[model samples]
Target: EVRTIKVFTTVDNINLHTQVVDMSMTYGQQFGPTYLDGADVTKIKPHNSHEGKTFYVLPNDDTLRVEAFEYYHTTDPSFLGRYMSALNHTKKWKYPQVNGLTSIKWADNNCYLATALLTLQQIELKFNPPALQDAYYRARAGEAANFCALILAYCNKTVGELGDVRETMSYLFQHANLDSCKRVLNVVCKTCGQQQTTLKGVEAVMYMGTLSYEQFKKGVQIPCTCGKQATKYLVQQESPFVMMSAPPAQYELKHGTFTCASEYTGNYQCGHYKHITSKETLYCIDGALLTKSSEYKGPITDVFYKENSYTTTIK
Candidate 1:
């Protein structure tokens, strides 16, 4: 016989006159995100600020070709926007030169060797190519840009020999070590009154560069050309440590409020366990009924019971 009965309305008042509820009434309770009528696609698409930026290169050759690189190799338009904005196009077109001469029409406008090298460094700083997994030749592409810029920069300058610049760019691209980034600095021996020009690692270069001219003069220190420990000033230098700033992952907890129609009562008598068979509109977030409840109508579902063998002993 099918029958509907009154169940506990308020959980605070449920156990006042009854024993503890048993588990026999938990037969058909179920839940899922798709149960609701308007449960369609996820509406919220989380985004970040950097996704709007686009990365590209200006090669020395003037064929006029362009391509877009993506972090996520996705075709879905909804999921595609997050990876795009994080990158931006490089402003300067620094390319390789032959003995300080470039083939490009606007070669004069490009930065000189040292400036061009730093330009490549800035591009590397802005869009760390390794992170762009879709770009198969990211390393080569970046190194090529660096090589071109270095060549063009070295065109007029005698210091940047084509072979040395090529080899240096190769080593820098491969290892990206701190010592590889050379900065020209002038140092004076405080004791002997001797002046020296030398190449120093980027750390010293960066430290000296970060300081103002007066601050540098006061705080900077370097090994003297006379082989003694002393302070050196007057520098000419990205500190090579520009790291990529990808968005960090975030986690969120989702709570599904459920309603148990024929909730178990604390008593067991005759052959079946007693239950609160009423359709109460109250809901609960906790897995256990006694934990807590909210006033809203939550995941609505009915509970049923399994037939139990009758026993003579009753509680």
Candidate 2:
């Protein structure tokens, strides 16, 4: 029989959930290696938290499997073995108790990414003018201003009144702008002077976003009055004309201190918390800050265990 449990945990305390599977085997089956796995464990956010939790299955699953557990965590002093060892028990599965099994791993450092996102949000609110004012100012500038504004504006809709809208706004804007006019065909007929043209260089960077160039240019033919079909030609081989380019928004990660902490406020007998402080600087992409990454400069502290009592059994 398969006994599985859905483990509800936070990726840095934000409720990213997954499950672990356990199964019982017969006498002969016990000779085979045991397999325990979490479904889509790596796909969850704060994914690196489960970095080294993979354990080698031993033949005998009767014991607590501490031998296999130590094999992985022994080298990794950051695994919080002492604290967890104090909390864990040696009782075999045959002597089941009510204590919920708690697994621990160091979460990936997200302070830089989080702060960059916050800075992007801050810039949109503080440095960038309101949509209405921007629209009015651009309107007064000239037709060129209006045209430029049309492309420059992150989103068609106005920003939300109170909360940060930059991330969603950028995503919506990027989708709307980049996904338009992708199927551009440029072909000249071989037999006649017939020439067919779609937007030039739309096939360069933006076109490749949704569809490949070959796919876009495939089956593209100009049916000319000269009684022959024309195929794609002379778009560019050596160097193509980059007709359109939009510089990515840039932000600075000013040198300053930041901290990230994971707090467990549960009623468990042994609760743990993680906290770290880091400071550094690097350039960041304004719209795609979430995609950018950085590393923690300092060592990750072991999970700080808070315990009211220490005993082998739970009453």
Name the best candidate (by TM-score): 1
Tell me the lDDT of model 2 at 209.
16
The C-alpha lDDT values of all candidates are 0.26, 0.26
Query: What TM-score, over all chains together, does every model reach?
Result: 0.19, 0.17
Q: Which candidate should be chosen as best, given lDDT against the real structure? A: 1
Task: Please give, for residues 143-216, the per-residue lDDT of candidate 1 as tens digits.
Answer: 33323332322222222222222233333333233444444344556687745454444332233122122334
RMSD of each: 36.0, 26.0
Question: Candidate 2 residues 1-315, lDDT tens each?
Answer: 334333332211122324343323221232223121312222233222333244222313323234323322222222222222211221111111111111112112212222222222221122122332343243233212221222222322221111112232333223222322222334666666544444422242222111112323343454566778765532322111111111111211112322221112222232222222222422222211211235322212111111121211211
